[PDB]
Amino acid sequence: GAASTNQLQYLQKVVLKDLWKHSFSWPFQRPVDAVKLQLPDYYTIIKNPMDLNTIKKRLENKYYAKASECIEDFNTMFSNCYLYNKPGDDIVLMAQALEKLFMQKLSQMPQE
């Protein structure tokens, strides 16, 4: 698009796709529905919420001027999970496995 054109493509076609395909991705695919999940404090504690669909649509809409802004959103998805929940929680173990895959794919991203 503009800055980091091949890198934004990689984030969309490799990183996002491979995280989505991962079997643990489903709790991270859409914004947390705090009414349906009965979590009235979720959006009190998490002020920068992020999910894979928001990243997907942002990439589709060319929202990111550079790849680092998209990487920030991926990292925020994980950090929000560890902030809201506790060690040993099922959602935290799922996030950790996804984050390990994310770090592999990010490490393989070709330079600009």
UniProtKB/Swiss-Prot annotation:
Tissue: Testis-specific. A 3-fold higher expression is seen in adult testis than in embryo testis. Expression seems to be correlated with histone H4 hyperacetylation during the haploid phase of spermatogenesis (spermiogenesis). No expression, or very low expression is seen in patients' testes with abnormal spermatogenesis. Expressed in cancers such as non-small cell lung cancer and squamous cell carcinomas of the head and neck as well as of esophagus, but not in melanoma or in cancers of the colon, breast, kidney and bladder.
Site location (Histone H4K5ac binding): 85, 90
Post-translational modification: Ubiquitinated in a SPOP-dependent manner, leading to proteasomal degradation.
Record-listed JQ1 binding positions: 85
Localization of this protein: Nucleus
Highest taxon, organism lineage: Eukaryota
Residue span(s) of domain Bromo: 5-109
Note from the entry: BRDT is a promising target for male contraception. Inhibition by thienodiazepine inhibitor (+)-JQ1 that binds Asn-85, prevents recognition of acetylated histone H4, causing a complete and reversible contraceptive effect in male mice.
Disease per record: Spermatogenic failure 21: An infertility disorder caused by spermatogenesis defects and characterized by acephalic spermatozoa in the semen of affected individuals. SPGF21 inheritance is autosomal recessive.
Function statement: Testis-specific chromatin protein that specifically binds histone H4 acetylated at 'Lys-5' and 'Lys-8' (H4K5ac and H4K8ac, respectively) and plays a key role in spermatogenesis. Required in late pachytene spermatocytes: plays a role in meiotic and post-meiotic cells by binding to acetylated histones at the promoter of specific meiotic and post-meiotic genes, facilitating their activation at the appropriate time. In the post-meiotic phase of spermatogenesis, binds to hyperacetylated histones and participates in their general removal from DNA.
Record's comment describing the protein's domains: Bromo domains mediate interaction with histones that have acetylated lysine residues at specific positions. Bromo domain 1 mediates binding with histone H4 acetylated at 'Lys-5' and 'Lys-8' (H4K5ac and H4K8ac, respectively). The bromo domains also recognize and bind a subset of butyrylated histones: able to bind histone H4 butyrylated at 'Lys-8' (H4K8ac), while it is not able to bind H4 butyrylated at 'Lys-5' (H4K5ac).
Quaternary organization: Interacts with mRNA splicing machinery proteins SRSF2, DDX5, HNRNPK and TARDBP. Interacts with the acetylated N-terminus of histone H1, H2, H3 and H4. Interacts with P-TEFb components CDK9 and CCNT1/cyclin-T1. Interacts with SMARCE1. Interacts with the acetylated N-terminus of histone H1.4, H2A, H2B, H3 and H4.
Family of this protein: Belongs to the BET family.
Protein name (record): Bromodomain testis-specific protein
